[PDB]
């Protein structure tokens, strides 16, 4: 179906995403997912961010954030890299919009196993959990929500 | 000496291009000072099987325009570029 079979997110990385989102309920926020693939499993080890502009309906991360983060990871002895991105959708529920899909297609072109994490800070799933999904564009071009642990 | 061997050695400046996303190999391209950023990005996208209209090269702390020459940027043998893509949501 899809390049990535499932996603494993380090709890602190998820916590960083949720806190970032929850700290700005008045606009979408975005950032980058750092990790590595392990076979068909995508590991998310960290989430990082930087300068950006956003509104309740839109967000763009300054492109120099990615440039800085990629160069740092490449220079370091860690075998970690950017594996995806995240953004929030306060009060708008969890899906990939047409804009998001275009961004995600471009991520996947560079790294087939890339994923997009979307979080809605104002809601909780259902036992409770955080309201988020991790998406990928499948081999036939459909958005699929991946299994996450 | 094959007629095209001369073309192989044109430009003894080596540049390193780091793909921003994924852990894939950096590219080490042999280029001339008179090359455009666009010409570099074209070769990078060919090597990585990317479309041509979705990425940008960065150098130091700025995104480059495809029309700029490496010469105009003060690029030297060994310098490093990052190939980025946009991160935009809605
Ligand atoms: Zn979105």
Author numbering:
A (entry chain A): -3 to 122, 126 to 148
B (entry chain C): -11 to 78
What do the study authors state?
C. subterraneum Ub (CsUb), E1, E2, and E3 are organized in a single operon, adjacent to a second E3 protein and a JAMM protease (CsRpn11) with high sequence similarity to eukaryotic Rpn119. We have shown that CsRpn11 is highly active on its own, cleaving both CsUb precursors and, at a later stage of the ubiquitination cascade, CsUb-conjugated substrate proteins.
The structure was solved by molecular replacement using the CsRpn11Δ149–202 and CsUb coordinates and indeed revealed the architecture of the CsRpn11–CsUb complex. The complex is stabilized by a network of hydrogen bonds and a hydrophobic interaction involving the CsUb hydrophobic patch. Via an induced-fit-binding mechanism it is now ordered into a β-hairpin that associates with a newly formed β-strand of the CsUb C terminus. Our results show that the Ub-binding mode of AMSH, Rpn11, and CSN5, which is similar to that of the SAMP–JAMM interaction, was already established in an archaeal ancestor, and that CsUb binding alone can trigger the conformational switch in Ins-1, obviating the need for additional factors.
